[PDB]
């Protein structure tokens, strides 16, 4: 399986630096140039640059030539992007993407992407979430199905991730967009619908990650 896997979300202070990683597996890392892309809401996508991992040479968008520094470690099949002298304008999702070329038609494009890394630049301190059960009950049944979930409250910065039963449960899952509370902290719920029949014999656990605070929790959700 060709895939790119990126480092988890980070908080950094104004003026500091961060170094983001992109591990390549399932192919010879040195064979494909690795590109990086920035994404912010209503700012589309911006191309940052690429590195040739075989040679170590990198090429930049002029706009990022003073911001980004690309490196590659051949032994660990990992590409890195350092972002220097951070500002609020650097808060974004950053992707790595591999370039492929097809000699038969001259076509080249980004064929595989990392899942992205969220970076928030802020002076405020991190805060990990409090995770509460949204318990299934008669007030959450319909037919022979029941809704249950987890409330992920009071964290900073974004994002959290939520899986169910370590990723075994995906159908019916709705993880909502976070909302900013008046407190300056974020909150979100993740919900799933399951067979009401299953509530007695099937365990449901939400697996909550808050990479910017380096915290994780599992919360068992009982009827």
């Amino acid at each position: 399986q060709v895939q790119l896997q990126q480092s988890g979300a980070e908080l950094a202070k104004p003026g500091a630096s961060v170094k983001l990683s992109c591990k390549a597996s399932g192919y010879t890392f040195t064979s494909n140039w690795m590109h990086w892309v920035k994404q912010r809401p209503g700012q589309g996508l911006e191309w940052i640059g690429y590195i040739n991992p075989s040679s170590g040479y990198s090429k930049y968008n002029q706009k990022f030539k003073d911001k980004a520094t690309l490196t590659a470690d051949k032994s660990s099949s990992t590409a890195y992007m350092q972002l220097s002298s951070l500002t609020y304008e650097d808060s974004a999702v950053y992707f790595c993407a591999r370039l492929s070329y097809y000699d038969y038609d001259g076509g080249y494009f980004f064929d595989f992407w990392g899942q992205g890394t969220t970076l928030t630049v802020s002076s405020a301190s991190t805060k990990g979430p409090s995770v509460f059960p949204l318990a299934p009950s008669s007030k959450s049944t319909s037919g022979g199905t029941a809704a249950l979930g987890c409330l992920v409250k009071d964290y900073f910065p974004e994002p959290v991730t939520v899986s169910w039963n370590s990723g075994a449960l995906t159908s019916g899952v709705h993880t909502f967009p976070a909302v900013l509370q008046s407190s300056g902290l974020y909150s979100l719920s993740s919900v799933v619908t399951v067979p009401s029949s299953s509530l007695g014999t099937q365990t449901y656990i939400c697996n909550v990650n808050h990479k910017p605070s380096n915290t994780k929790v599992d919360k068992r959700v009982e009827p």
Partner: protein, 218 residues
């Protein structure tokens, strides 16, 4: 640098209808070899962009034959012949004829479907949360269309104002519905002074407002 421009929105489309998304460049993307260095990507909600078309009109690996591309040196079109649920997301054009590579601002595609009422579910606060002095009451509207909905909270039949927040999912890629959470936040003190907690939802798929409620401690 080349500036790539797209429209922000595409007029929503019903499953089976055709749709057309445009993109334009400030410079020609036609190179001397006769090829035009324009790519199309689809970014589905929460995911990375995925290649659809390269060289302006070649479909990439595993891309449905419902997608096709055309254009001049500077004006381009992505054509979806018979739109489907899974097409929902943001479409981006990208020029790669020169560095720096540049992208359009993206075009969101929403699909239209039949009116569908929300399933409404309500969740009292956890004993664990209460111990720490706050109560969060959650009302869930699952799988409805269209997105417009009103959720009012009533505590002991008093309408609440200014103490709830809502959040809505992007359009589901299988059934083209939305889901929505409404969270009412109270102090432990205020929560424990009242009995009846109700979530009242108005929606076009509902003849009249549905109310889901519980009594504290039941």
């Amino acid at each position: 640098d080349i500036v790539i421009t797209q429209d922000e929105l595409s007029s929503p489309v019903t499953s089976g209808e055709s749709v057309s998304i445009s993109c334009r460049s400030s410079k020609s993307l036609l190179y001397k070899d006769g090829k035009t260095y324009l790519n199309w990507f689809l970014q589905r909600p929460g995911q990375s962009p995925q290649i659809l078309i390269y060289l302006m009109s070649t479909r990439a690996s595993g891309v449905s034959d419902r997608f096709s591309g055309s254009g001049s040196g500077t004006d381009f079109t992505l054509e979806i012949s018979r739109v489907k649920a899974e097409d929902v997301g943001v479409y981006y054009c990208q020029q790669v004829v020169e560095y720096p590579y540049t992208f359009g601002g993206g075009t969101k595609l929403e699909i239209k479907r039949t009116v569908a009422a929300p399933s409404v579910f309500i969740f009292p606060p956890s004993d664990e949360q209460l111990k720490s002095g706050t109560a969060s009451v959650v009302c869930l509207l699952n799988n409805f269309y269209p997105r417009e909905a009103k959720v009012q909270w009533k505590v002991d039949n008093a309408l609440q104002s200014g103490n709830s927040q809502e959040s809505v999912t992007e359009q589901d890629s299988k059934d083209s519905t939305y889901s929505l959470s409404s969270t009412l936040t109270l102090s432990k003190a205020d929560y424990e002074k009242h009995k009846v907690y109700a979530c009242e939802v108005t929606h076009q798929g509902l003849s009249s407002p549905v109310t889901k409620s519980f009594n504290r401690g039941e």
